[PDB]
């Protein structure tokens, strides 16, 4: 059950260098069994392998990136890192760290980290404002998450207990250059009253965390 998690700035100014770190759990990066690699996926696009590293320090790179990629491993911390120099708008993507089995069997990204979205931009970070969309057999309610930058925001309802009927829409880029989305859920008209509905909004690039209760009006 090896587990990987990446930590990144999220926002990187153009021409600057992106520095990502992947933290590994359950197995050691020193093991001869794994290749530790990075894969990125531009917003609407497919997967592109960036580079991989073996424990001896043996580094494989993409032919398209070789110039700008630098991958290192830290056994004391059981992490491995990504260094992408001279960031371009083309480099904006979700960056995955993954491992791959080297000895036992053929190469295949067994286990992935969650995504980390890196947007190459000069604009500053801005946390979202969260506004309730109050309800009036089936009713709809939600939260308007407005005027934040950059992507992404995570929206959960009732600390994750409310998943059925939840639709969190893709964010749209507004005239102002800030992102905005709505998260809605359809619940029975009976709830309204007996049931509490709280949307939990997390914006990691700004470390802003808002809980907003949605009450019928």
């Amino acid at each position: 059950q090896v587990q990987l998690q990446e930590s990144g700035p999220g926002l990187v100014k153009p021409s600057e260098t992106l520095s990502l770190t992947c933290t590994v759990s359950g197995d050691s990066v020193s093991s001869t069994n794994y290749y530790w690699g990075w894969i990125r996926q531009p917003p609407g696009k497919g997967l592109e392998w960036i580079g991989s590293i073996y424990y001896r320090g043996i580094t494989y790179n993409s032919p398209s990136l070789m110039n700008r990629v630098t991958i290192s491993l830290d056994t004391a911390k059981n992490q491995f890192s990504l260094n992408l120099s001279s960031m371009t708008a083309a480099d904006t993507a979700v960056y995955f760290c993954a491992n791959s089995i080297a000895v036992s069997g053929p190469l295949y990204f067994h286990h992935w980290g969650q995504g980390t979205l890196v947007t190459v931009s000069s604009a500053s970070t801005k946390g979202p404002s969260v506004f309730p969309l109050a309800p009036s057999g089936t009713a709809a309610l939600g939260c308007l998450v407005k005027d934040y930058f950059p992507e992404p925001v995570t929206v959960s309802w009732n600390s994750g207990a409310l998943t059925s009927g939840v639709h969190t829409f893709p964010a749209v880029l507004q005239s102002s250059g800030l992102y905005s989305l709505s998260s809605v859920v359809t619940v029975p008209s009976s709830s309204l009253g007996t049931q509490t509905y709280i949307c939990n909004v997390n914006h990691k690039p700004s470390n802003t965390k808002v809980d907003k209760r949605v009450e019928p009006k």
């Binding site: 053929p106 190469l107 506004f131 969309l133």
Partner: protein, 215 residues
């Protein structure tokens, strides 16, 4: 060096029918081809490795075939859960890796009319100086839908934006938000705000409306 070519790019099939995805190789692969399934916003999942051996836990409905230049991913019977993007992946006994551009599999299903809801701007928002009116279309199919905003009976243009969810994984429907962006001064300028929804499942366009300051 070696490049992967997936066909087709997008695909739409009804539930239960058989679907075929093709990935073509620059040279005699013979290394290995692997198949991944990716759901929106999530990390991809390995379905098949070594061309034909299914990853563990994967439904028997998935199958892999082929060797050399041509390979195939096959789904015996489509399920609503199968909505995803599918990637072939190449590698040898050592890196580098290569991916295909990917194949998006959408689902054909029965026509479903949307449920329409309208939300006036919250009081909390109107205190910040902005008024966003939100019209919600729930669980409809097909994806093609038309939403019209009329303010005091006058059709608007250019001040609304919409976004759509990915195809739902249990019932194969879509949902849509239409957001009309206004300034607080202009929202207090009018009375009637109406959302008009046109869709194939609707006999007539459906309108949801509210009078500002009535509740």
């Amino acid at each position: 060096d070696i490049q992967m070519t997936q066909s087709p790019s997008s695909l739409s099939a009804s539930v239960g029918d058989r679907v075929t995805i093709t990935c073509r190789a620059s040279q005699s692969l013979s290394g290995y081809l692997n198949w991944y399934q990716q759901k929106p916003g999530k990390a991809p999942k390995l379905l098949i490795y070594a061309t034909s051996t299914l990853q563990r836990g994967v439904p028997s409905r998935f199958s892999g075939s082929g060797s050399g230049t041509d390979f195939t991913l096959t789904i015996s019977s489509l399920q609503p859960e199968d909505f995803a993007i599918y990637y072939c992946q190449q590698s040898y006994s050592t890196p580098p890796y290569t991916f295909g551009q990917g194949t998006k599999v959408e689902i054909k299903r029965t026509v479903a009319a949307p449920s329409v809801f309208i939300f006036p701007p919250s009081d909390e928002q109107l205190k910040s100086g902005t008024a966003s009116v939100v019209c919600l279309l729930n669980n409809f199919y097909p994806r093609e839908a038309k939403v019209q905003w009329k303010v005091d009976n006058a059709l608007q243009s250019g001040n609304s934006q919409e976004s759509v969810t990915e195809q739902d994984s249990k019932d194969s429907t879509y949902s849509l938000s239409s957001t009309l962006t206004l300034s607080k001064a202009d929202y207090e300028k009018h009375k009637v705000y109406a959302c008009e929804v046109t869709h194939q499942g609707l006999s007539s366009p459906v309108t949801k409306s509210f009078n500002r300051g009535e509740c």
